[PDB]
């Protein structure tokens, strides 16, 4: 059973507050249902994974759906470069998440390595790409721009 404390506090500080509060709120039952849905995967896409979740839990399914629709609409407003970055960042974050469901949770060095890559991809974008991303994701843009992500990653 995954516990919120399993994630280092300084990595949780890099996550947007809505994502942090979603995870912090999880009951023991919520975590069982998330793990069972993940284990009954893989799925065609995120939407199919959420539909399977809603079947087990209309309430947790609706909570996940609300977060997902907000992220999906923010990505839809991006130009091709910032969309590519956001989608690659999500793929990296999902691989980290997969490790908390399956055996052997990521180490702090594994998390530092994932942030280091996401930051590198952020820095690889043009200024127009960074500005486009920042308009939709101001918390994450600030984590990158302030040096907060670099401090965690170690560099
Ligand atoms: C990241 C916001 C939550 C998104 C919806 C799925 C939540 C269930 C995940 C449980 C395992 C915790 C994973 C922590 C690492 C990470 O979120 O990147
Ligand atoms: C069952 C938990 C999964 C919910 C994850 C919600 C937070 C991440 C949102 C990013 C969506 C990316 C676009 C959809 C791509 C796809 O369907 O493969």
Author numbering: 0 to 154
What text appears in the publication on this structure?
Fatty acid and retinol-binding proteins (FARs) comprise a family of unusual α-helix rich lipid-binding proteins found exclusively in nematodes. They are secreted into host tissues by parasites of plants, animals and humans. The protein Na-FAR-1 derives from the blood feeding intestinal hookworm of humans, N. americanus. The 3D structure of Na-FAR-1 in its ligand-free and ligand-bound forms, determined by NMR (nuclear magnetic resonance) spectroscopy and X-ray crystallography respectively, reveals an α-helical fold similar to Ce-FAR-7, but Na-FAR-1 possesses a larger and more complex internal ligand-binding cavity and an additional C-terminal α-helix.
Na-FAR-1 presents a wedge-shaped structure with two larger faces each of approximately 40 by 30 Å in area and of ∼17 Å in width at the wide end of the wedge. In the holo structure the expanded cavity is lined by the same residues as in the apo structure, but with 21 additional, predominantly apolar, side chains contributing to the surface of the expanded cavity (Phe1, Ile6, Leu25, Lys30, Lys34, Val36, Ser48, Ile49, Leu52, Met69, Phe84, Ala85, Ile91, Ile95, Tyr99, Leu110, Ser113, Phe132, Phe136, Val142 and Ala148).
